[PDB]
A paper describes a structure:
Here we report the crystal structures of a novel transcriptional repressor RolR and its complex with the regulator resorcinol. The RolR protomer is folded as two domains, the DNA-binding domain at N-terminal and the signal-receiving domain at C-terminal. In addition, RolR is the sole TetR-type regulator that has been identified for regulation of aromatic catabolism. RolR is an all-helix protein and each subunit is composed of 9 α helices (h1, h2, h4–h10) and two 310 helices for h3 and g1, a stretch between h1 and h2.
The crystal structure of the apo-RolR is solved by the molecular replacement method using the N- and C-domains of res-RolR structure as initial models. The structure is refined to 3.6 Å resolution and the statistics are listed in Table 1. At this resolution, the electron density maps are qualified for fitting well to all mainchains and about 1/3 sidechains, which make the reliability to analysis the apo-RolR structure on the mainchain and secondary structure level with some sidechains for a part of residues. The final apo-RolR model contains two dimers, AB and CD, in the asymmetric unit, which have the dimeric organization same as that in res-RolR. The general structures of these two dimers are very similar with a Cα r.m.s.d of 0.9 Å, we therefore use the dimer CD in the following comparative analysis due to its better fitting to density maps. The apo-RolR structure shows the similar general fold to that of res-RolR, but the DNA binding domain shows some relative movement in comparison with that in complex res-RolR (2a, 2c). Besides, some subtle distinctions for h3 and g1, the stretch between h1 and h2, are observed, which take a short 310 helix and a loop, respectively. Structural comparison shows that the frameworks of the binding pockets in apo- and res-RolR structures are very similar without obvious conformational change at mainchains. The structural comparison between apo-RolR and res-RolR show that the orientations of DNA-binding motif h2–h3 and h2′–h3′in dimerization have been swung about 10 degree referring to the C-domain from the ligand-free form to the ligand-binding form, which further make the center-to-center separation of the DNA-binding domain (defined as the distance between residues Tyr68 in h3 and h3′) shortened from 34.9 Å to 30.1 Å upon the ligand-binding. In this way, residues Arg122 and Arg74 restrain the conformations of residues Glu45, Arg46, Val48 and Val51 via hydrogen bonds in the ligand-bound form but not in the ligand-free form after the 10 degree swing.
Author numbering:
A (entry chain A): 32 to 184, 193 to 224
B (entry chain B): 31 to 184, 193 to 224
Protein backbone atom coordinates (compact mmCIF):
# COMPACT_ATOMS: atom_id res chain seq x y z
CA UNK A 1 0.00 0.00 0.00
CA UNK A 2 3.03 2.15 0.63
CA UNK A 3 4.35 2.05 -2.95
CA UNK A 4 1.04 0.91 -4.44
CA UNK A 5 -0.20 4.51 -4.30
CA UNK A 6 2.94 6.20 -5.55
CA UNK A 7 3.09 3.45 -8.21
CA UNK A 8 -0.19 4.28 -9.92
CA UNK A 9 0.46 7.96 -9.25
CA UNK A 10 3.56 7.61 -11.35
CA UNK A 11 1.63 5.71 -14.05
CA UNK A 12 -0.70 8.66 -14.46
CA UNK A 13 1.77 11.53 -14.65
CA UNK A 14 2.13 10.52 -18.32
CA UNK A 15 -0.33 7.72 -19.05
CA UNK A 16 -3.81 8.94 -18.18
CA UNK A 17 -5.47 8.34 -14.81
CA UNK A 18 -7.56 5.77 -16.65
CA UNK A 19 -4.96 3.66 -18.43
CA UNK A 20 -3.51 2.04 -15.32
CA UNK A 21 -4.16 -1.66 -14.64
CA UNK A 22 -3.22 -3.68 -11.58
CA UNK A 23 -0.67 -5.65 -13.64
CA UNK A 24 1.65 -2.62 -13.89
CA UNK A 25 0.89 -1.24 -10.46
CA UNK A 26 1.53 -4.40 -8.40
CA UNK A 27 4.77 -4.80 -10.34
CA UNK A 28 5.85 -1.27 -9.45
CA UNK A 29 4.89 -2.01 -5.87
CA UNK A 30 6.77 -5.30 -6.14
CA UNK A 31 3.96 -7.70 -5.27
CA UNK A 32 2.09 -10.25 -7.42
CA UNK A 33 -1.21 -9.46 -9.18
CA UNK A 34 -3.10 -11.60 -6.68
CA UNK A 35 -1.78 -9.76 -3.64
CA UNK A 36 -3.01 -6.24 -4.56
CA UNK A 37 -6.44 -7.41 -3.53
CA UNK A 38 -5.18 -7.50 0.05
CA UNK A 39 -4.64 -3.73 0.34
CA UNK A 40 -7.42 -2.38 -1.87
CA UNK A 41 -10.72 -4.19 -2.69
CA UNK A 42 -11.52 -2.36 -5.93
CA UNK A 43 -9.51 -0.23 -8.38
CA UNK A 44 -11.59 2.88 -7.76
CA UNK A 45 -10.44 2.24 -4.19
CA UNK A 46 -6.78 2.73 -5.10
CA UNK A 47 -7.37 5.57 -7.50
CA UNK A 48 -9.16 7.30 -4.62
CA UNK A 49 -6.18 6.92 -2.31
CA UNK A 50 -4.03 8.32 -5.08
CA UNK A 51 -6.39 11.32 -4.97
CA UNK A 52 -6.48 11.80 -1.20
CA UNK A 53 -2.72 11.51 -1.08
CA UNK A 54 -2.72 14.29 -3.72
CA UNK A 55 -5.11 16.70 -2.12
CA UNK A 56 -3.31 16.12 1.17
CA UNK A 57 0.10 17.18 -0.22
CA UNK A 58 -1.56 20.45 -1.20
CA UNK A 59 -3.75 20.48 1.89
CA UNK A 60 -0.50 20.54 3.85
CA UNK A 61 1.30 22.88 1.49
CA UNK A 62 -1.54 25.40 1.72
CA UNK A 63 -1.53 25.50 5.53
CA UNK A 64 2.23 26.25 5.64
CA UNK A 65 1.96 29.39 3.47
CA UNK A 66 -1.54 30.88 3.38
CA UNK A 67 -2.85 31.06 6.95
CA UNK A 68 0.21 33.27 7.28
CA UNK A 69 -1.81 36.16 5.82
CA UNK A 70 -3.75 38.16 8.45
CA UNK A 71 -6.96 38.44 6.40
CA UNK A 72 -9.37 35.48 6.55
CA UNK A 73 -10.98 36.34 3.20
CA UNK A 74 -7.57 35.93 1.54
CA UNK A 75 -6.58 32.68 3.21
CA UNK A 76 -9.81 31.23 1.84
CA UNK A 77 -9.52 32.78 -1.59
CA UNK A 78 -5.84 31.93 -1.71
CA UNK A 79 -6.37 28.23 -0.89
CA UNK A 80 -9.27 28.08 -3.36
CA UNK A 81 -7.30 29.81 -6.12
CA UNK A 82 -4.52 27.29 -5.58
CA UNK A 83 -6.97 24.41 -5.84
CA UNK A 84 -8.34 25.68 -9.12
CA UNK A 85 -5.04 26.88 -10.53
CA UNK A 86 -3.91 23.36 -9.62
CA UNK A 87 -6.59 21.25 -11.33
CA UNK A 88 -5.60 23.09 -14.46
CA UNK A 89 -1.86 22.31 -14.44
CA UNK A 90 -1.42 18.80 -12.88
CA UNK A 91 -2.44 16.22 -15.51
CA UNK A 92 -3.22 13.79 -12.71
CA UNK A 93 -5.44 16.45 -11.08
CA UNK A 94 -7.46 17.11 -14.19
CA UNK A 95 -8.35 13.44 -14.04
CA UNK A 96 -9.50 13.66 -10.41
CA UNK A 97 -12.48 15.87 -11.29
CA UNK A 98 -13.78 15.42 -14.81
CA UNK A 99 -13.28 11.71 -14.27
CA UNK A 100 -13.30 10.64 -10.64
CA UNK A 101 -16.81 10.51 -9.22
CA UNK A 102 -15.94 10.30 -5.56
CA UNK A 103 -14.28 13.64 -6.32
CA UNK A 104 -16.67 15.33 -3.89
CA UNK A 105 -16.33 13.04 -0.86
CA UNK A 106 -12.66 12.59 -1.55
CA UNK A 107 -12.42 16.37 -0.98
CA UNK A 108 -14.58 16.36 2.16
CA UNK A 109 -12.08 13.97 3.68
CA UNK A 110 -8.83 15.71 2.81
CA UNK A 111 -9.80 19.40 2.83
CA UNK A 112 -13.20 19.27 4.54
CA UNK A 113 -11.65 19.89 7.95
CA UNK A 114 -9.36 22.62 6.55
CA UNK A 115 -12.32 24.24 4.79
CA UNK A 116 -14.39 24.46 7.94
CA UNK A 117 -11.24 25.63 9.68
CA UNK A 118 -10.99 28.70 7.45
CA UNK A 119 -14.71 29.31 6.94
CA UNK A 120 -15.02 29.34 10.73
CA UNK A 121 -12.00 31.55 11.34
CA UNK A 122 -13.23 34.14 8.86
CA UNK A 123 -16.61 33.87 10.53
CA UNK A 124 -15.55 34.53 14.14
CA UNK A 125 -13.77 37.51 12.57
CA UNK A 126 -17.02 38.82 11.24
CA UNK A 127 -15.41 38.78 7.80
CA UNK A 128 -17.83 36.07 6.58
CA UNK A 129 -21.57 35.59 7.03
CA UNK A 130 -22.30 31.91 7.41
CA UNK A 131 -25.62 30.41 8.55
CA UNK A 132 -24.31 26.82 8.55
CA UNK A 133 -20.56 26.26 8.56
CA UNK A 134 -21.22 22.90 6.88
CA UNK A 135 -23.49 23.79 3.98
CA UNK A 136 -21.17 26.67 3.29
CA UNK A 137 -18.30 24.26 3.56
CA UNK A 138 -19.93 21.71 1.23
CA UNK A 139 -21.05 24.18 -1.44
CA UNK A 140 -17.50 25.51 -1.40
CA UNK A 141 -16.64 22.05 -2.65
CA UNK A 142 -19.54 21.28 -4.90
CA UNK A 143 -18.72 24.58 -6.54
CA UNK A 144 -15.00 23.91 -6.76
CA UNK A 145 -15.76 20.89 -8.89
CA UNK A 146 -18.40 22.27 -11.26
CA UNK A 147 -16.28 25.37 -11.68
CA UNK A 148 -13.36 23.20 -12.72
CA UNK A 149 -15.16 20.79 -14.99
CA UNK A 150 -16.45 23.86 -16.77
CA UNK A 151 -13.04 25.44 -16.89
CA UNK A 152 -11.72 22.13 -18.31
CA UNK A 153 -14.06 22.47 -21.35
CA UNK A 154 -10.70 31.88 -13.70
CA UNK A 155 -8.85 31.00 -10.53
CA UNK A 156 -10.07 34.46 -9.56
CA UNK A 157 -13.55 34.81 -11.03
CA UNK A 158 -14.14 31.68 -8.92
CA UNK A 159 -12.57 32.66 -5.63
CA UNK A 160 -14.26 36.02 -6.02
CA UNK A 161 -17.57 34.16 -6.30
CA UNK A 162 -17.03 32.15 -3.16
CA UNK A 163 -16.06 34.97 -0.81
CA UNK A 164 -19.30 36.44 -2.03
CA UNK A 165 -21.35 33.40 -0.95
CA UNK A 166 -19.56 33.63 2.40
CA UNK A 167 -21.10 37.07 2.61
CA UNK A 168 -18.27 39.39 1.53
CA UNK A 169 -19.21 42.63 -0.25
CA UNK A 170 -19.79 41.78 -3.96
CA UNK A 171 -17.19 44.36 -4.99
CA UNK A 172 -14.48 43.97 -2.31
CA UNK A 173 -14.75 40.30 -3.27
CA UNK A 174 -13.30 40.44 -6.75
CA UNK A 175 -10.44 42.50 -5.33
CA UNK A 176 -9.31 39.89 -2.80
CA UNK A 177 -9.59 36.99 -5.20
CA UNK A 178 -7.41 39.14 -7.44
CA UNK A 179 -4.44 39.77 -5.14
CA UNK A 180 -0.89 38.46 -5.60
CA UNK A 181 -0.99 34.75 -4.84
CA UNK A 182 1.67 33.42 -2.45
CA UNK A 183 3.66 30.42 -3.57
CA UNK A 184 2.52 26.93 -2.62
CA UNK A 185 5.97 25.42 -3.10
CA UNK B 1 -43.80 5.17 -27.00
CA UNK B 2 -40.73 6.81 -25.43
CA UNK B 3 -43.33 8.23 -23.05
CA UNK B 4 -44.81 5.10 -21.51
CA UNK B 5 -41.32 3.69 -20.99
CA UNK B 6 -40.07 6.52 -18.80
CA UNK B 7 -43.32 6.19 -16.83
CA UNK B 8 -42.93 2.43 -16.54
CA UNK B 9 -39.48 2.88 -15.04
CA UNK B 10 -40.49 5.61 -12.59
CA UNK B 11 -42.89 3.31 -10.76
CA UNK B 12 -40.46 0.38 -10.81
CA UNK B 13 -37.41 2.32 -9.75
CA UNK B 14 -39.35 4.52 -7.37
CA UNK B 15 -40.34 1.21 -5.82
CA UNK B 16 -37.48 -1.29 -6.42
CA UNK B 17 -34.32 0.80 -6.40
CA UNK B 18 -33.05 2.75 -9.41
CA UNK B 19 -29.98 0.48 -9.16
CA UNK B 20 -31.91 -2.74 -9.92
CA UNK B 21 -34.32 -1.79 -12.72
CA UNK B 22 -33.18 -3.73 -15.77
CA UNK B 23 -34.04 -2.68 -19.31
CA UNK B 24 -36.14 -5.84 -19.13
CA UNK B 25 -38.57 -5.26 -16.28
CA UNK B 26 -38.93 -1.67 -17.53
CA UNK B 27 -40.30 -2.49 -20.94
CA UNK B 28 -42.49 -5.23 -19.51
CA UNK B 29 -44.20 -2.20 -17.97
CA UNK B 30 -45.00 -0.34 -21.19
CA UNK B 31 -45.28 -3.92 -22.46
CA UNK B 32 -42.18 -4.84 -24.46
CA UNK B 33 -39.33 -7.33 -23.77
CA UNK B 34 -35.66 -6.42 -23.32
CA UNK B 35 -34.12 -6.82 -26.75
CA UNK B 36 -37.01 -4.78 -28.11
CA UNK B 37 -36.01 -1.59 -26.19
CA UNK B 38 -32.16 -1.67 -26.50
CA UNK B 39 -33.14 -0.63 -30.03
CA UNK B 40 -35.66 2.13 -29.22
CA UNK B 41 -33.35 3.66 -26.59
CA UNK B 42 -29.52 3.41 -26.80
CA UNK B 43 -28.80 2.39 -23.23
CA UNK B 44 -30.67 2.03 -19.95
CA UNK B 45 -28.68 5.04 -18.72
CA UNK B 46 -30.38 7.29 -21.25
CA UNK B 47 -33.86 6.22 -20.21
CA UNK B 48 -32.87 6.81 -16.58
CA UNK B 49 -31.87 10.33 -17.57
CA UNK B 50 -34.92 10.75 -19.74
CA UNK B 51 -36.73 10.30 -16.40
CA UNK B 52 -34.42 12.87 -14.80
CA UNK B 53 -34.73 15.74 -17.25
CA UNK B 54 -38.42 14.92 -17.52
CA UNK B 55 -38.82 14.94 -13.73
CA UNK B 56 -37.24 18.39 -13.70
CA UNK B 57 -39.13 19.92 -16.64
CA UNK B 58 -42.14 19.21 -14.41
CA UNK B 59 -41.22 21.41 -11.46
CA UNK B 60 -39.49 23.72 -13.92
CA UNK B 61 -42.41 24.52 -16.19
CA UNK B 62 -44.38 24.64 -12.95
CA UNK B 63 -42.01 27.15 -11.25
CA UNK B 64 -42.37 29.43 -14.26
CA UNK B 65 -46.13 29.66 -13.94
CA UNK B 66 -45.63 31.02 -10.44
CA UNK B 67 -42.40 32.44 -8.98
CA UNK B 68 -41.49 34.49 -12.10
CA UNK B 69 -44.65 36.50 -11.45
CA UNK B 70 -42.97 37.74 -8.25
CA UNK B 71 -41.43 41.24 -8.32
CA UNK B 72 -38.07 41.04 -6.57
CA UNK B 73 -35.79 38.76 -8.68
CA UNK B 74 -33.65 37.62 -5.71
CA UNK B 75 -36.90 36.07 -4.56
CA UNK B 76 -37.82 34.41 -7.84
CA UNK B 77 -34.38 32.81 -7.67
CA UNK B 78 -34.12 32.05 -3.94
CA UNK B 79 -37.71 30.97 -4.10
CA UNK B 80 -37.21 28.70 -7.07
CA UNK B 81 -34.25 27.13 -5.26
CA UNK B 82 -36.00 26.66 -1.90
CA UNK B 83 -38.61 24.83 -3.98
CA UNK B 84 -36.04 22.51 -5.59
CA UNK B 85 -34.58 21.76 -2.14
CA UNK B 86 -38.01 21.02 -0.64
CA UNK B 87 -38.89 18.78 -3.50
CA UNK B 88 -35.76 16.68 -2.95
CA UNK B 89 -36.29 16.05 0.75
CA UNK B 90 -39.91 15.24 -0.17
CA UNK B 91 -39.64 12.49 -2.84
CA UNK B 92 -38.28 8.96 -2.84
CA UNK B 93 -37.98 9.52 -6.60
CA UNK B 94 -36.06 12.83 -6.47
CA UNK B 95 -33.81 12.22 -3.50
CA UNK B 96 -32.85 9.25 -5.66
CA UNK B 97 -31.61 11.15 -8.72
CA UNK B 98 -28.96 13.00 -6.68
CA UNK B 99 -27.43 10.47 -4.30
CA UNK B 100 -27.32 8.04 -7.21
CA UNK B 101 -26.81 9.83 -10.52
CA UNK B 102 -23.68 11.17 -12.14
CA UNK B 103 -25.83 13.23 -14.47
CA UNK B 104 -27.13 14.79 -11.29
CA UNK B 105 -25.44 18.02 -12.25
CA UNK B 106 -25.37 17.72 -16.08
CA UNK B 107 -29.07 16.90 -16.42
CA UNK B 108 -29.88 19.61 -13.92
CA UNK B 109 -27.97 21.92 -16.22
CA UNK B 110 -29.83 21.01 -19.43
CA UNK B 111 -33.29 21.34 -17.85
CA UNK B 112 -33.45 23.88 -15.03
CA UNK B 113 -30.07 25.21 -16.14
CA UNK B 114 -31.21 27.95 -18.59
CA UNK B 115 -34.09 28.98 -16.35
CA UNK B 116 -31.45 29.78 -13.76
CA UNK B 117 -29.54 31.79 -16.35
CA UNK B 118 -32.67 33.71 -17.33
CA UNK B 119 -33.62 34.72 -13.80
CA UNK B 120 -29.98 35.42 -12.82
CA UNK B 121 -29.25 37.53 -15.91
CA UNK B 122 -32.38 39.48 -15.17
CA UNK B 123 -31.69 40.29 -11.53
CA UNK B 124 -28.35 41.17 -13.03
CA UNK B 125 -29.94 43.96 -15.12
CA UNK B 126 -32.31 45.11 -12.38
CA UNK B 127 -29.09 45.69 -10.45
CA UNK B 128 -30.25 43.01 -8.04
CA UNK B 129 -27.18 40.80 -8.49
CA UNK B 130 -23.43 41.17 -9.08
CA UNK B 131 -22.43 38.21 -11.26
CA UNK B 132 -19.22 37.99 -13.34
CA UNK B 133 -19.42 34.69 -15.20
CA UNK B 134 -23.09 33.95 -15.75
CA UNK B 135 -22.00 30.45 -16.68
CA UNK B 136 -19.92 29.91 -13.55
CA UNK B 137 -22.79 31.32 -11.55
CA UNK B 138 -25.44 29.03 -13.01
CA UNK B 139 -23.24 25.93 -12.69
CA UNK B 140 -22.00 26.61 -9.17
CA UNK B 141 -25.62 27.11 -8.14
CA UNK B 142 -26.61 23.64 -9.26
CA UNK B 143 -23.38 22.06 -8.16
CA UNK B 144 -24.30 23.53 -4.80
CA UNK B 145 -27.92 22.41 -4.83
CA UNK B 146 -26.76 18.83 -5.34
CA UNK B 147 -23.85 19.15 -2.90
CA UNK B 148 -26.33 20.56 -0.37
CA UNK B 149 -29.35 18.33 -0.92
CA UNK B 150 -26.95 15.41 -0.56
CA UNK B 151 -25.81 16.61 2.85
CA UNK B 152 -29.47 17.11 3.75
CA UNK B 153 -30.02 13.44 2.90
CA UNK B 154 -27.60 11.82 5.36
CA UNK B 155 -32.46 23.94 5.34
CA UNK B 156 -33.96 25.34 2.16
CA UNK B 157 -33.98 28.91 3.49
CA UNK B 158 -30.35 28.55 4.65
CA UNK B 159 -29.11 27.29 1.26
CA UNK B 160 -30.99 30.02 -0.63
CA UNK B 161 -29.56 32.69 1.66
CA UNK B 162 -26.13 31.43 0.60
CA UNK B 163 -27.07 31.23 -3.06
CA UNK B 164 -28.08 34.88 -2.98
CA UNK B 165 -25.07 35.98 -0.97
CA UNK B 166 -23.23 34.31 -3.84
CA UNK B 167 -24.90 36.16 -6.69
CA UNK B 168 -24.40 39.43 -4.86
CA UNK B 169 -27.44 40.12 -2.64
CA UNK B 170 -26.60 41.86 0.64
CA UNK B 171 -25.13 39.32 3.10
CA UNK B 172 -27.69 40.52 5.64
CA UNK B 173 -30.68 41.25 3.39
CA UNK B 174 -29.94 37.81 1.99
CA UNK B 175 -31.79 35.75 4.60
CA UNK B 176 -34.82 38.05 4.80
CA UNK B 177 -35.46 37.56 1.07
CA UNK B 178 -35.04 33.82 1.58
CA UNK B 179 -37.38 33.43 4.56
CA UNK B 180 -40.29 35.16 2.85
CA UNK B 181 -43.50 33.08 2.38
CA UNK B 182 -42.83 30.46 -0.28
CA UNK B 183 -45.72 30.36 -2.79
CA UNK B 184 -47.31 27.08 -3.96
CA UNK B 185 -46.57 25.30 -7.26
CA UNK B 186 -47.54 22.36 -9.62
Amino acid sequence: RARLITSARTLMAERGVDNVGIAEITEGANIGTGTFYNYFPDREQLLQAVAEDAFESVGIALDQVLTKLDDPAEVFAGSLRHLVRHSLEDRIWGGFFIQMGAAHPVLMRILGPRARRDLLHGLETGRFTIEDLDLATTCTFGSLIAAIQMALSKDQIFAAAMLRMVGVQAAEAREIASRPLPEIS
